[PDB]
């Protein structure tokens, strides 16, 4: 019940096509975030930099989605859609679209939001559904990736499963307009619902990498996906590292910025540890070095100030 | 004398336990560690590294 060249080549072409689309659209929405939030949506409440930085996160995450599809390109080229772990990847890719569309029913920001989202989500639904019907007839870096998947899981499971937050009132804030002492709105809600999907994409990328290269197929050429998991990350962090200068309020709402900051930090430290290969036993050598030093210190202290070592120990020969 | 001889041939494990093992390798190290950690302020050099 193997997979001949037919389904393999069809899946490969599907993957490369949709992934190129996601990649170029990610670059486009990056420059659009650099332009403004009125680039794609119609909510008139979009005169704030927080929409801009949220959209920068959107950009980096769609870059990550491109990386995911290039990963599946490189993986299924050897017809590796037979092991149950690729079935896990595909079913979770389907769950991406599942949660996305059911939450779109639970809320929508602008027509183009559902446009792009349902576009590529229906692409995923069709491919995974029909190919899974066909298949029916057939350490340290690990710690970082595990915490990444669980932090992003928490970010989603908390953000969407509840309706929405309410901004601080700040009683007495210019009783006129300028939204001071007011509630929230379409722009905010939907732009945010996006960011959640971006962190979902990188969540799925990371769960795939963990459950696949937890024996760290071939462990190395994942170097492709690695770039897609690092590059985006650092650039994301960049924007965040200047969000205070941009005059944004990132601190009042933990349910959104927390996962973004934590995932950026985790991806950056993952890149760093992959550059020098902390072997999960080198920390043992570090702690042993510091303990040896402090042992050498307390021995000198004891022999100099408390009780000589030639006194307390026994002497031989008489 | 005969009773002592009989009892000594049946009690070798307990004799070694009470003569060589009870204090020196069971009670003394426990007492020593608990007593050291009773004194000795809640530092790290003093709570873990110097012991």
């Amino acid at each position: 019940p193997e997979l001949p060249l037919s389904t393999n080549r069809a899946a490969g072409t599907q993957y490369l096509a949709i992934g190129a689309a996601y990649a170029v659209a990610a670059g486009a929405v990056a420059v659009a975030a650099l332009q403004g939030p009125q680039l794609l949506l119609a909510s008139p409440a979009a005169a704030d930099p927080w929409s801009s930085v949220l959209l920068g996160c959107v950009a980096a995450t769609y870059l990550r989605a491109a990386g995911v599809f290039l990963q599946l390109k490189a993986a299924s080229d050897a017809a590796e859609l037979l092991c149950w772990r690729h079935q896990r990847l595909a079913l979770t890719a389907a769950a991406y679209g599942m949660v996305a569309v059911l939450t779109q029913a639970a809320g929508l920001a602008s027509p183009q939001l559902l446009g792009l989202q349902l576009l590529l989500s229906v692409a995923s639904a069709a491919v995974v559904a029909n190919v899974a019907r066909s298949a029916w007839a057939v350490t340290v870096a690990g710690l970082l990736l595990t915490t990444t998947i669980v932090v992003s899981l928490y970010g989603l499971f908390a953000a969407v499963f509840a309706p929405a937050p309410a901004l601080p009132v700040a009683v007495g804030a210019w009783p006129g307009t300028a939204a001071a002492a007011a509630v929230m709105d379409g722009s905010a809600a939907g732009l945010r619902r996006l960011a959640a999907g971006g962190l979902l994409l990188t969540a799925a990328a990371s769960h795939g990498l963990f459950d696949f290269a937890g024996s760290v197929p071939n462990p190395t050429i994942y170097s492709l996906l690695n770039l897609g998991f690092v590059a985006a990350a650092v650039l994301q962090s960049y924007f965040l590292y200047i969000a205070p200068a941009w005059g944004v309020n990132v601190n009042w709402d933990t349910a959104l910025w927390g996962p973004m900051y934590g995932t950026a930090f985790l991806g950056l430290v993952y890149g760093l540890v992959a550059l020098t290969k902390f072997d999960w036993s080198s920390v043992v050598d570090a702690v042993l070095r510091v303990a040896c030093w402090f042992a050498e210190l307390t021995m000198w202290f004891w022999d100099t100030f408390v009780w000589k070592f030639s006194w307390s120990e026994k002497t031989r020969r008489a | 004398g005969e009773r002592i001889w009989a009892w000594r041939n049946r009690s070798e494990n307990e004799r070694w336990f009470w003569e060589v093992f009870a204090w020196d390798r069971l009670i003394f190290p426990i007492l020593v560690i608990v007593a050291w950690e009773y004194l000795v302020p809640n530092h790290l050099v003093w709570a873990v590294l110097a012991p």
Binding site: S312, E313 | Y38
Partner: peptide, 24 residues
């Protein structure tokens, strides 16, 4: 192949005893 038992701790010196009165 060993058991789970302490080691003797007083075959070298006698300083350890200094903790039993003081703590007491």
């Amino acid at each position: 192949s060993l058991y789970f038992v302490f080691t003797q701790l007083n075959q070298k010196t006698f300083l350890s005893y200094w903790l039993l009165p003081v703590a007491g």
